[PDB]
Amino acid sequence: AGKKVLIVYAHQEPKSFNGSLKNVAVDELSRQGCTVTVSDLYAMNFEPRATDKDITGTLSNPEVFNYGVETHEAYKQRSLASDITDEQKKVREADLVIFQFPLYWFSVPAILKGWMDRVLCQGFAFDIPGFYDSGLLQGKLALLSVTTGGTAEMYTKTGVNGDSRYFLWPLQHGTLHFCGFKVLAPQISFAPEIASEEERKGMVAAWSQRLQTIWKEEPIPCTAHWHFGQ
Amino acid sequence: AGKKVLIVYAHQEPKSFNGSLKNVAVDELSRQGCTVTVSDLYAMNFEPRATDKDITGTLSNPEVFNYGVETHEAYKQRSLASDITDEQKKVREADLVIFQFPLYWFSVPAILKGWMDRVLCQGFAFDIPGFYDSGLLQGKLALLSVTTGGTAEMYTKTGVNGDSRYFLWPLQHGTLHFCGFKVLAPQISFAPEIASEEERKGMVAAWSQRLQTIWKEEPIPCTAHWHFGQ
Numbered sequence: 051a052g053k054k055v056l057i058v059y060a061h062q063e064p065k066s067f068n069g070s071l072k073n074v075a076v077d078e079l080s081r082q083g084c085t086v087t088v089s090d091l092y093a094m095n096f097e098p099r100a101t102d103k104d105i106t107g108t109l110s111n112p113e114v115f116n117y118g119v120e121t122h123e124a125y126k127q128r129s130l131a132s133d134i135t136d137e138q139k140k141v142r143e144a145d146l147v148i149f150q151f152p153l154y155w156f157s158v159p160a161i162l163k164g165w166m167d168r169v170l171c172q173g174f175a176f177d178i179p180g181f182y183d184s185g186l187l188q189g190k191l192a193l194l195s196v197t198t199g200g201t202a203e204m205y206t207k208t209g210v211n212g213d214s215r216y217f218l219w220p221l222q223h224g225t226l227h228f229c230g231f232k233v234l235a236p237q238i239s240f241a242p243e244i245a246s247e248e249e250r251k252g253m254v255a256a257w258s259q260r261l262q263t264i265w266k267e268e269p270i271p272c273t274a275h276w277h278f279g280q
Numbered sequence: 281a282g283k284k285v286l287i288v289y290a291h292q293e294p295k296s297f298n299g300s301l302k303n304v305a306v307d308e309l310s311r312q313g314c315t316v317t318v319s320d321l322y323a324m325n326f327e328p329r330a331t332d333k334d335i336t337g338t339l340s341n342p343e344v345f346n347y348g349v350e351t352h353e354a355y356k357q358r359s360l361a362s363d364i365t366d367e368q369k370k371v372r373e374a375d376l377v378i379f380q381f382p383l384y385w386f387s388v389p390a391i392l393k394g395w396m397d398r399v400l401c402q403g404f405a406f407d408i409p410g411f412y413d414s415g416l417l418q419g420k421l422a423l424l425s426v427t428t429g430g431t432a433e434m435y436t437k438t439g440v441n442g443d444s445r446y447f448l449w450p451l452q453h454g455t456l457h458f459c460g461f462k463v464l465a466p467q468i469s470f471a472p473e474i475a476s477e478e479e480r481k482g483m484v485a486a487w488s489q490r491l492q493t494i495w496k497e498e499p500i501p502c503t504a505h506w507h508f509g510q
């Protein structure tokens with residue numbers, strides 16, 4: 051309670067394991083008294099491409115299109131497209147942002163990559179100065195809640211896929227830490243599709259339980275050592 | 281060379297540094313007598329979202345949609361959307377696939393992540409089993425040609441961003457090696473926007489010059505040790 055949460059959710063099927071993890075997060079955080087908002091990217095048909103449509107009115111340089119410069123200037127001039135500014139409002143108000151998605155190619159599904167690319171623009175999420183520890187979203191918490199096709203064992207250092215931490219680097223460090231977030235420990239639900247009726251219940255309930263004390267948690271130290279060393 | 285090359289290119293502006301890099305690759309590979317195809321994903325308005333529009337037949341499970349299961353079936357039955365099969369034909373014929381893109385959030389722009397999520401489907405690019413060294417695209421080469429905002433110094437072990445190889449992992453290992461590609465060493469053009477006019481010219485020529493002898497290169501050992509060290 052006393053806290054706002056945004057859940058950015060990227061799965062096509064409400065009946066999925068991901069849908070159930072999103073729905074228990076809404077149920078538990080709402081029960082606590084928290085303010086909860088969900089960006090259901092597939093239901094929003096969220097646009098993932100970074101294009102000159104993201105700037106309304108006239109371009110800062112209509113001869114040579116530079117997306118990073120154009121969106122930084124549009125942010126400053128309040129001329130970003132309304133899909134982007136609608137998500138920036140949600141993020142500005144939120145104390146915690148939870149991303150709920152299936153792992154696609156050791157990363158986020160493209161529709162959620164497009165949310166990161168287009169919503170987290172210069173002047174909003176980071177700047178010169180203001181990145182990593184001083185990123186502009188500092189004071190906010192972020193959490194990846196990821197489901198995988200691969201088993202926890204495939205995801206060990208000398209397993210086929212390498213350690214989980216290795217694929218988290220670009221998301222936790224290159225994106226969430228960069229913008230100033232304190233990153234809570236990821237929630238990894240390994241291989242739900244090959245698990246029992248039960249077991250899947252256990253993974254959902256562990257997530258609901260964890261959410262009971264989410265505001266007591268300490269952030270991970272979001273460092274190269276955390277992801278790569280021992 | 282009697283070889284076919286596919287360049288999958290992700291930049292909005294033909295006059296950009298990335299556009300110069302793509303065009304020098306076409307110029308040099310064409311000069312060598314290679315067969316060259318470019319998939320210019322923004323000009324194509326390439327769809328990045330993985331949705332049930334990607335399958336045109338009867339779904340295997342119309343009550344609970346599972347993108348992986350439905351696209352795997354659809355590939356076997358030939359009922360995937362034609363944009364996906366257009367790209368699969370290009371990849372099937374290619375001996376080398378070059379990806380040319382600006383780094384976005386330590387990864388690929390979302391339009392290109394969509395190309396990976398939708399084009400590299402089960403059945404086509406990998407099977408379970410039939411992945412990493414037994415992936416379905418064995419015998420083919422792939423190369424990432426990436427441009428960055430950050431300087432080379434920023435992308436070292438003790439730099440802010442950590443080593444450049446760390447962010448390559450989900451792309452080289454988790455996607456290309458997974459599909460059975462041999463991965464050539466990445467071409468990383470650091471911080472062109474801050475470079476001098478003539479440093480930019482030097483990076484473009486360094487890539488043209490490397491392309492002269494590309495068919496003589498051996499692939500990297502695409503392992504955890506190469507990416508992260510000891």
Ligand SMILES: Cc1cc2nc3c(=O)[nH]c(=O)nc-3n(C[C@H](O)[C@H](O)[C@H](O)COP(=O)(O)OP(=O)(O)OC[C@H]3O[C@@H](n4cnc5c(N)ncnc54)[C@H](O)[C@@H]3O)c2cc1C
Pocket residue numbers: 061063065066067068069070151152153154155156157196197198199200201242243244247250251254344346347348396397398454
């Ligand atoms: C393009 C693509 C790329 C991929 N890349 C990777 C990758 O790099 N690495 C990797 O490891 N995997 C990868 N995968 C696999 C993907 O990560 C998994 O398929 C996904 O994470 C499984 O989550 P899901 O919600 O879609 O499972 P679901 O199939 O929706 O759920 C599993 C089962 O649980 C049921 N269920 C729903 N709610 C509940 C609940 N209340 N309690 C109990 N059961 C419930 C479902 O109906 C279903 O039978 C990829 C898949 C695709 C399509």
Ligand SMILES: Cc1cc2nc3c(=O)[nH]c(=O)nc-3n(C[C@H](O)[C@H](O)[C@H](O)COP(=O)(O)OP(=O)(O)OC[C@H]3O[C@@H](n4cnc5c(N)ncnc54)[C@H](O)[C@@H]3O)c2cc1C
Pocket residue numbers: 100116117118167168224291295296297298299300381382383384385386387427428429430431472473474477480481484
């Ligand atoms: C959403 C987003 C996320 C980003 N995330 C990251 C990230 O995680 N890490 C990171 O390091 N960076 C990041 N960046 C920055 C991005 O990677 C760089 O801006 C991009 O790599 C620079 O490439 P470009 O082709 O767009 O440069 P350009 O701005 O086109 O190139 C700079 C100059 O090169 C010139 N040029 C073009 N052709 C030639 C030629 N033949 N000879 C000489 N000069 C030429 C152009 O005219 C221009 O003046 C991000 C940017 C965005 C928009």
Ligand SMILES: COc1ccc(OC)c2c(C)cc(=O)[nH]c12
Pocket residue numbers: 155198199200201204211348408454458
């Ligand atoms: C059934 O789907 C999957 C199951 C398990 C996987 O890794 C253990 C993958 C990977 C790595 C890529 C992918 O595209 N699909 C996968």
Ligand SMILES: COc1ccc(OC)c2c(C)cc(=O)[nH]c12
Pocket residue numbers: 118224228385386428429430431434441
């Ligand atoms: C021009 O924009 C940028 C320049 C340099 C960068 O790193 C040195 C970044 C990073 C790391 C993330 C990002 O989103 N944008 C960047």
Ligand SMILES: COc1ccc(OC)c2c(C)cc(=O)[nH]c12
Pocket residue numbers: 172176177178181429430431471474
């Ligand atoms: C770590 O962040 C950064 C690294 C390197 C950069 O250029 C060399 C930038 C620029 C140009 C703008 C910016 O906002 N952030 C940057």
Ligand SMILES: [Zn+2]
Pocket residue numbers: 222223224227228271272273274
């Ligand atoms: Zn970090």
Ligand SMILES: [Zn+2]
Pocket residue numbers: 452453454457458501502503504
């Ligand atoms: Zn590898």
